Amino acid sequence: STGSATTTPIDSLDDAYITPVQIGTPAQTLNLDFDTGSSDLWVFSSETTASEVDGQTIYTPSKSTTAKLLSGATWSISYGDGSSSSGDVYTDTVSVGGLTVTGQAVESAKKVSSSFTEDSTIDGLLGLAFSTLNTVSPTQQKTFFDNAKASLDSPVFTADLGYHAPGTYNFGFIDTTAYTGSITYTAVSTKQGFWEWTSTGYAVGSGTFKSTSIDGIADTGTTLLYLPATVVSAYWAQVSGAKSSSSVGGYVFPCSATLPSFTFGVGSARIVIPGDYIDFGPISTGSSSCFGGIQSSAGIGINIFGDVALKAAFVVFNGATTPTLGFASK
Ligand SMILES: Nc1ccc(F)cn1
Numbered sequence: 001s002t003g004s005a006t007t008t009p010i011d012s013l014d015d016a017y018i019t020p021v022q023i024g025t026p027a028q029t030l031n032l033d034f035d036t037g038s039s040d041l042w043v044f045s046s047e048t049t050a051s052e053v054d055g056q057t058i059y060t061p062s063k064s065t066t067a068k069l070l071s072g073a074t075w076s077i078s079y080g081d082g083s084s085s086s087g088d089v090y091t092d093t094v095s096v097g098g099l100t101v102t103g104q105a106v107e108s109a110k111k112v113s114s115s116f117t118e119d120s121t122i123d124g125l126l127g128l129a130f131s132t133l134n135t136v137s138p139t140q141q142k143t144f145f146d147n148a149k150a151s152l153d154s155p156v157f158t159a160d161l162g163y164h165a166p167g168t169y170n171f172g173f174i175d176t177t178a179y180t181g182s183i184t185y186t187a188v189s190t191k192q193g194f195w196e197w198t199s200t201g202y203a204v205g206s207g208t209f210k211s212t213s214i215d216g217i218a219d220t221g222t223t224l225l226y227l228p229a230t231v232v233s234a235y236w237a238q239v240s241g242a243k244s245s246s247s248v249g250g251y252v253f254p255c256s257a258t259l260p261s262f263t264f265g266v267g268s269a270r271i272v273i274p275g276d277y278i279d280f281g282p283i284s285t286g287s288s289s290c291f292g293g294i295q296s297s298a299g300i301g302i303n304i305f306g307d308v309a310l311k312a313a314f315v316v317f318n319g320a321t322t323p324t325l326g327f328a329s330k
Contacts, residue, residue, distance in 0.1 A: 001151040002172035003099025007034065007161065010121040013280055014307060015223050017161060018121060019169055022095040023106060024064030030057050030123040034169055035221030036159070036195050036317065037304075039133035039143050040077050041094070042085060042107035043124035044116075052112045055120030061108065067092045075107045075135045080222075080300065083115045089136055094144060096126075099171050101148050105134075105141035128157065128220070128317070133193035145171070145319060155319045159220055160330070161311035163277055179314035179328035184269035188323040194219075195317060197325050199305070200267060202227075204235050205260030209270070216303030218315065218325055224280075225262075225273075226297035226304040235262060235294050242292070248283050251292040255282060262294060264309060266327040273312040 007017040018031035023043070030043055044056040061067035068091045076086040087110035094104040109124070116122070127134070131142045149155050152172035160168045160178050168178070189196040199214040214227065232251070236242040238260050242253040253259070259275030278293040293308040316326030 001099055001148070002153055003095075003097040003148075003170070005097035005169050007167045007169050009162070009164065009166075010119070012164065014161075014164060014311065016119075016122060017167070017220070017307070018123075019096070019126070021126060023059055024061070024092050025066040026064075027095070028057075028059055028064070030059060031121065032124045032126040033122050033221060034126050034128060034159075035219070036128045037217060037219035037221040038077070038079070038125060039127040039129045039131055039193065040075060040107055040135055041105065041124070041126050041144055042075065042077070042087070042109055044112065045087070045108040047087060048109045049111055052117045054117050057123045059106065059108065059124075061090045061092070061106075064092055066102075067106075070105065070136075070139075073139060074137055076137075077135050081115065083113045085109050085112045085116060087111065089141070096144065096169070096171065099148055099151075101144055104144060104147055105136060107136070125221070129195065130190050130193045132190075148172075149319060157317045157319070159310060159315045159317065161220070161307060163274075163311050167311075174316060179330045181329055183314070183316060183326040183328040184266045185316075185318070185324045185326045186266055188318075188325055190323060192217075195323070195325060200265030202231060202265065203263035203270070204238050205275075207238075209263065209265070211265075214264070214303055216297075216305050218310065218317070219304050219306050220310060222304045222306035223293075223308070224304075224306050225278075225294045225308040226300055226302075226306065227294060228303065229296045229298050232294055232296045235260070236292065244296075245289075248289075248291070250295045252283060252289045253292055255288050255290040257290075264305070269327065269329075271309070271313045271327055271329060273309060277308055277312060 073089040280291040
């Protein structure tokens with residue numbers, strides 16, 4: 001079995017990507033945020049507090065002939081940005097681009113935090129990290145990828161995110177036409193439940209490459225690139241007028257400046273992120289200060305290779321017995 005689906009940016013800044021998912025019988029299509037930094041499949045539903053729903057498409061388990069309430073099961077999640085959601089759990093049929101999983105745990109949101117209610121284009125999340133992170137109590141549940149793995153031609157999924165344009169999420173196969181050159185594979189550590197790997201270094205613009213180990217996670221659910229203070233300072237020192245702002249909460253730069261590119265190492269291979277991908281536009285409408293896409297991970301505790309880095313490459317998440325990450329230039 002294989003599955004193929006288009007992922008579309010939610011706004012002109014590429015803040016998040018939505019992918020249509022079919023849930024239940026007859027199918028109810030919801031636009032979900034595919035997140036490799038979490039492991040819960042949760043949706044806005046007929047059970048979510050009415051005041052916390054503003055334009056999202058909801059899942060209605062009562063209208064699904066295949067929906068089963070998982071008796072006594074509850075879930076509760078908290079993300080790195082201080083956002084959260086919780087509720088009860090159902091089992092139902094879930095399909096992504098023609099790939100079907102029966103008996104998938106679908107977490108029905110009863111309470112969602114403000115950042116979710118405010119984001120009317122996102123109907124929920126589809127976690128693609130390892131299942132040890134799933135928050136279903138008292139019986140932990142498997143992710144969509146874990147449930148589909150037996151049926152897949154190859155136990156892999158690929159992320160090919162577009163820059164201001166649509167992209168693709170493929171399951172069960174590698175599209176040899178979606179990248180150039182060869183794929184460089186790197187080791188994954190699953191100890192924290194994430195797709196965790198080690199970058200071999202970096203370069204700023206046309207500068208010399210610095211060989212230094214950078215441990216971080218491949219996260220499609222995070223918009224920006226979060227790197228150690230030293231690395232981030234070295235990058236913004238090359239942008240005239242750039243400074244770190246406590247009021248804004250990170251590095252800002254004059255909107256009229258040209259941003260240098262950022263290179264990260266994958267083994268002996270290099271991935272170049274064009275400077276244009278690092279521009280996140282004005283901090284406020286009309287402002288001449290622009291927000292940077294490369295920020296410090298000092299307050300996070302973990303380095304995150306978010307959408308800013310991933311959209312610059314073809315990314316293979318090899319979920320074989322010993323997991324690996326593949327990167328290729330596109
Ligand atoms: N990995 C993440 C980070 C934030 C969020 F809202 C969802 N997923």
